[PDB]
Amino acid sequence: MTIATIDIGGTGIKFASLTPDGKILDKTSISTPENLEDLLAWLDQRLSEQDYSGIAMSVPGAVNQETGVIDGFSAVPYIHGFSWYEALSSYQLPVHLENDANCVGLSELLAHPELENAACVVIGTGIGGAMIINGRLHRGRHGLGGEFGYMTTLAPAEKLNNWSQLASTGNMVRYVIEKSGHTDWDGRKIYQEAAAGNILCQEAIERMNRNLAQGLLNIQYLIDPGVISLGGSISQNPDFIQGVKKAVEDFVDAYEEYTVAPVIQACTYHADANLYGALVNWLQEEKQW
Amino acid sequence: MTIATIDIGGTGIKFASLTPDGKILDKTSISTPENLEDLLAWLDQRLSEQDYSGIAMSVPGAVNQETGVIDGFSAVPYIHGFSWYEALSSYQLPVHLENDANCVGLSELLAHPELENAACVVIGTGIGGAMIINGRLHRGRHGLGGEFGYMTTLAPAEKLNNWSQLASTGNMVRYVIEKSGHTDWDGRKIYQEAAAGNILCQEAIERMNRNLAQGLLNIQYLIDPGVISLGGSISQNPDFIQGVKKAVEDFVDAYEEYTVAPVIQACTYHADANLYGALVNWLQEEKQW
Numbered sequence A, B: 001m002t003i004a005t006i007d008i009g010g011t012g013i014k015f016a017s018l019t020p021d022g023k024i025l026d027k028t029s030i031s032t033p034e035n036l037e038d039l040l041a042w043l044d045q046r047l048s049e050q051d052y053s054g055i056a057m058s059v060p061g062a063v064n065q066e067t068g069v070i071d072g073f074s075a076v077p078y079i080h081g082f083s084w085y086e087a088l089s090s091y092q093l094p095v096h097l098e099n100d101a102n103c104v105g106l107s108e109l110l111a112h113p114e115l116e117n118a119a120c121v122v123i124g125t126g127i128g129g130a131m132i133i134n135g136r137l138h139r140g141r142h143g144l145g146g147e148f149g150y151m152t153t154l155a156p157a158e159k160l161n162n163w164s165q166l167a168s169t170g171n172m173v174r175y176v177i178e179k180s181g182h183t184d185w186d187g188r189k190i191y192q193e194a195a196a197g198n199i200l201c202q203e204a205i206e207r208m209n210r211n212l213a214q215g216l217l218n219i220q221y222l223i224d225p226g227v228i229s230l231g232g233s234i235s236q237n238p239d240f241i242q243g244v245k246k247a248v249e250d251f252v253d254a255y256e257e258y259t260v261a262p263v264i265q266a267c268t269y270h271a272d273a274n275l276y277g278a279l280v281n282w283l284q285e286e287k288q289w
Ligand SMILES: OC[C@H]1O[C@@](CO)(O[C@H]2O[C@H](CO)[C@@H](O)[C@H](O)[C@H]2O)[C@@H](O)[C@@H]1O
Pocket: A084, A085, A086, A088, A089, A090, A091, A092, A093, A094, A095, A096
């Protein structure tokens, strides 16, 4: 059994053949096509060249599990408005799709197959997330389960002041860009410069970690997960992870109200997390998990 | 089949015989006893006088479903630190207990047996809650599921600024008490006086509803329930319910970020909500639901 596993994003399309244990057997990618018709022909070319038992996909936007339709909006607009169950029917394979942040959450089941209740917070330009409840994805009435970036941790005012706005890597970058006066920054450089003495980076980091810690304690007391995994590029840096944990410890010690602290850990995967999670989504929906 | 149903609180102990459809067949109460030994003898007297098939209980504090022990702290301290499975073993009946705010959430299943995913926010002196996920109570790793009163909607500072502090009936009362200069207030009087022209009451109400609306949109975007039910004494007033909904509509219209609005409704029950919910908890744990 091989699963044709597909990650569609603005940054490119990946196609990989995975085993049911989650081993990548081969991996290829192209630049995002200009039109649906060029993507379907690429996908036809990849699918045609092994005997696949299933097609699993990580996509941006909100999937309707009943129709195969991806709603909402994303960086790849031509993927929306039709049934992928129909678009791929001719392979006569079971097809499942799932939203990318949910995929990242499910990839943790491969790494930690004993997880029952878990939250995953994917930190990028904004903040997306996922919930697992008794070993399964929790999607919610309107597929909005685990949209932790919508959480307002300040009173809305001129701006919504949702978590994505206050606590994301993109918004830490946007803040150092505004005060440094130039745009040659990313999260990883902010870290090097703070380590080198750079005061404004030190402070960008402290605000970031403190806003994350406030929002992570909310998640802990609202859904009470066994663990919260942090994903996205920045969670791949152990200095970020240690800084967030210390920031959480500091809230807990300061407010007598707090008893339990969340268990926090970096996501296991990142670069291929959507492949692994789209795989694990396929296996669960087909009940081979 | 009759279930001996018990609600233990600081305000008194209720004992009622319920049918499995949720009909109260008889209902009695006493003042909270001064000691465990007087409560167990009262309970023995009530239990002795019909043929019960089960014992269902609503209790304050955190229940350990495996041990029957109620942890934490409450207004009735002598109920903590022992197994109620042991304390009641001699009746040789199935015994289940559940925390009171969770009970209130489960009472909604009696009123609305089709609920799959639901949040319940119990508004009193503070804010407690419950989550239902696929028709069952979600308790979480540390029985903290649905402790929505712990959610911080402002940055912590001198005070934690958790939802219970900013949005509860008790804290609306505490605010009118502080500015009116006297203590002859409750939520229901605040409403009459605001209706009569009283400006400070009008404002207490507006702050209350606006803080509730902010926190209710968080719940909607974080767990994405089909409905949020509001319980506690104040939710029994239709003017409060209408004011909260309008306050939510006003956030939605103001922030382009918001698409879906929560469906909000008053809890069906209040005065006997713990009895009904403790009943429904019993039936689910015994798989007769
Ligand atoms: O998993 C979707 C996938 O399965 C196929 C057949 O292998 O279609 C089946 O599933 C669809 C979704 O419910 C049905 O509408 C269809 O009629 C059924 O045969 C493929 O056509 C499709 O890509």
